[PDB]
């Protein structure tokens, strides 16, 4: 048998199965009641159910059988660029709509149009979005577009004006933890207390990344072979997250302020293989949200962390950048 990711395995089938998007679900139901479906713009925090809801809407529109013949799922972050995506969209639109069978027509509305689902639309440049708008207005009769993005403000005004916008609220921590617990119970995954909370915290509330991390942790636990429960250290290891003890030791070494001690500790730390970017991110999280530091210290350390992150994003030596960042923080 084939293997399927848990993200696509536990997608809601129909609109009624979406938990914490009642406003968008109601608006989409009202639109579905109308015979005409306009272009749609699904925007909100990542991992809230945008793709799940559009897939459920498509399944209700076309039926489980005709759905695969009416959908072109594309990603705007394709490395091949604008030309390949636009050519694929044009080829999909040019092809005539497949004729539904009698069963599909009698059991489902089967609207004449075909739905194109484009993901990460906000990552497109202005020229790409203008070309997409030209294609949309060219084939508006046959193809209806659905743009999925995290920030509606990244989409140009001419393209955004043509799309009815649905805003998805960020999932409540209770709802996300309940969904993760249900998935773990269905998949027979043993977890200790607070493991799902740690997974959600690492994923920063993104339920997609949380489900992916849970599946990876389940695979790792199966490979462990002892049958014991998944622990927080395992999920931290699989996500590339530095343990809190090492971060506390880094903080103490910075607080002491001795240059030689900090250099020695950084040299020792670079031998353990932990990612420096994760260290910078966790240091930012620790220092910014700490009540024991005044406004001036945070003002300086935000710029310090920003400069270190900008230099790290350029593909530089992690040891030098980390040592410089720690030394600069220790001087505050």
């Amino acid at each position: 048998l084939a293997q399927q990711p848990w993200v696509e395995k536990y997608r809601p089938k129909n609109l009624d199965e979406v938990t914490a998007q009642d406003h968008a679900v109601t608006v989409l139901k009202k639109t579905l009641k109308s015979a005409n479906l306009p272009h749609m713009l699904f925007y909100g925090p990542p991992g809230t159910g945008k793709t799940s809801t559009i897939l459920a809407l498509t399944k209700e529109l076309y039926g489980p059988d005709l759905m695969k013949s009416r959908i072109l799922e594309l990603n705007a972050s394709d490395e091949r660029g604008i030309s390949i995506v636009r050519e694929k969209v044009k080829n999909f639109a040019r092809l005539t709509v497949s004729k539904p069978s009698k069963h599909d027509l009698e059991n489902y509305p089967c609207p004449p149009y075909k739905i194109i689902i484009l993901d990460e639309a906000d990552s497109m440049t202005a020229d790409a979005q203008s070309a997409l708008r030209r294609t949309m207005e060219t084939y508006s009769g046959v193809t209806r577009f659905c743009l999925i993005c995290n920030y509606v403000t990244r989409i140009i005004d001419p393209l955004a004006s043509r799309c009815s916008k649905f805003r998805f609220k960020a999932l409540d921590a209770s709802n996300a933890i309940d969904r993760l617990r249900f998935i773990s119970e269905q998949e027979n995954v043993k977890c200790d207390d607070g493991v799902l909370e740690r997974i959600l915290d690492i994923s920063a509330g993104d339920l997609r990344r949380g489900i992916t991390l849970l599946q990876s942790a389940s695979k790792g636990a199966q490979y462990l072979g002892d049958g014991k429960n998944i622990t927080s250290t395992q999920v931290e290891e699989l996500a590339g997250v530095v343990p809190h003890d090492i971060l506390i030791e880094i903080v103490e070494k910075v607080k002491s302020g001795d240059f030689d001690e900090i250099k020695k500790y950084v040299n020792t730390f670079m031998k353990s293989g932990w990612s420096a970017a994760s260290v910078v991110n966790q240091l930012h999280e620790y220092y910014i949200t700490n009540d024991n530091f005044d406004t001036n210290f945070k003002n300086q350390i935000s710029w310090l962390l920003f400069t270190t992150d900008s230099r790290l994003n350029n593909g530089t030596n992690e040891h030098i950048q980390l040592l410089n960042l720690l030394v600069k923080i220790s001087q505050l």
């Binding site: 070309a131 005004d157 949200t289 710029w303």
Partner: protein, 322 residues
């Protein structure tokens, strides 16, 4: 029908704010000496309006027999539209008035076709065809052979003319618009009439009662997909007054719930801060330099939370200079 086509003026007398260009074109056409024309400038100024007005002034009821409007950026292909132009050129009409009036909208998006096909099209059909070229952005026009035209630059329309046209559209469509919504629409379109008409039509579409409900600034901002000034002002107030934890929480919550990118948030915050009264110019220097650095780093990728906290810290440090 789209409101762009529906409310396009039918006569040269209805064009507003371009009096000098209108008079020059009228002098050119009234004597039957229409040359090759090039209309360049910002979008939504009245280029296509002027060309259709002059075409209907020349021919009138039979203008469709001589004019041909084609889009350069059409998905059909540059070769296909070139063949269409060549086919229209070979057409012959009984009346000898005028010439072949081919309109190439958005012909500047021809980074290869401008030197490949446009040169041949301009040269070969000189004897019997008058060409019109429309450009929107900077000089992508390949000046090597672009010089064979009459240049005409369109300047953005005055705000009073835009307001009058908006009022005319409202009274024709029986639409009621709040003054705040009108101000927001004018600010967002910044003189682009295409944007004004498209946003007005879409906002009318979103109304459950087009003939009874009133379009507010919230509807305009939702339709345009732009950051609301209220959200940006709330973020700026939280950053300036509240402590670090509250400012961080407020910024993240606002720019995640409302779907505002960090770069757009920075742009809006800068726009708001430009109107602030600051005693020390070092505050302005620090704000501008740090925010530009943060925006440049955002363009390259990087850590999003770190960049947001960098924005907060930069604003706080700059305003620490009073």
């Amino acid at each position: 029908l789209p409101w762009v086509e529906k409310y396009r003026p039918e006569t040269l007398d209805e064009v507003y704010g371009q009096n000098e260009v209108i008079t020059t074109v009228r002098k050119f056409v009234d004597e039957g000496k229409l040359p090759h024309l090039l209309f360049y400038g910002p979008p939504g100024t009245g280029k296509t309006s002027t060309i259709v007005a002059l075409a209907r002034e020349i021919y009138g009821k039979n203008y469709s027999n001589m004019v041909l409007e084609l889009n350069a950026s059409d998905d059909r292909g540059i070769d296909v539209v070139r063949n269409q132009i060549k086919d229209f050129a070979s057409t012959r009409q009984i009346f000898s008035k005028g010439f072949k009036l081919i309109i190439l909208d958005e012909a500047d998006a021809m980074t290869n076709a401008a030197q490949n096909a446009l040169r041949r099209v301009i040269e070969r059909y000189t004897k019997n065809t008058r060409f019109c070229v429309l450009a929107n952005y900077a000089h992508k026009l390949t000046p090597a052979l672009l010089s064979r035209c009459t240049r005409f630059r369109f300047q953005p329309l005055p705000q009073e003319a835009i307001e009058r046209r908006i009022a005319n559209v409202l009274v024709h469509e029986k639409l009621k618009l709040s003054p705040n919504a009108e101000k927001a629409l004018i600010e967002l379109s910044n003189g682009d009439m295409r944007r004004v008409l498209n946003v007005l039509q879409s906002c009318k579409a979103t109304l459950d009662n087009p003939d009874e409900d009133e379009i507010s600034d919230d509807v305009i901002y939702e339709c345009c997909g732009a950051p609301r000034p209220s959200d940006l002002k709330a973020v700026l107030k939280s950053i300036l007054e509240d402590d670090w934890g509250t400012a961080h929480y407020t910024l993240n919550k606002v720019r995640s719930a409302k779907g505002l990118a960090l770069i757009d948030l920075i742009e809006g915050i800068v726009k708001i801060l430009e109107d602030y009264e600051l005693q020390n110019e070092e505050t302005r220097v620090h704000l501008l330099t740090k925010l530009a650095d943060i925006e440049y780093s955002i363009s390259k990728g990087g850590n999003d939370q770190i960049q947001g906290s960098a924005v907060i810290g930069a604003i706080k440090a700059s305003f620490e200079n009073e």
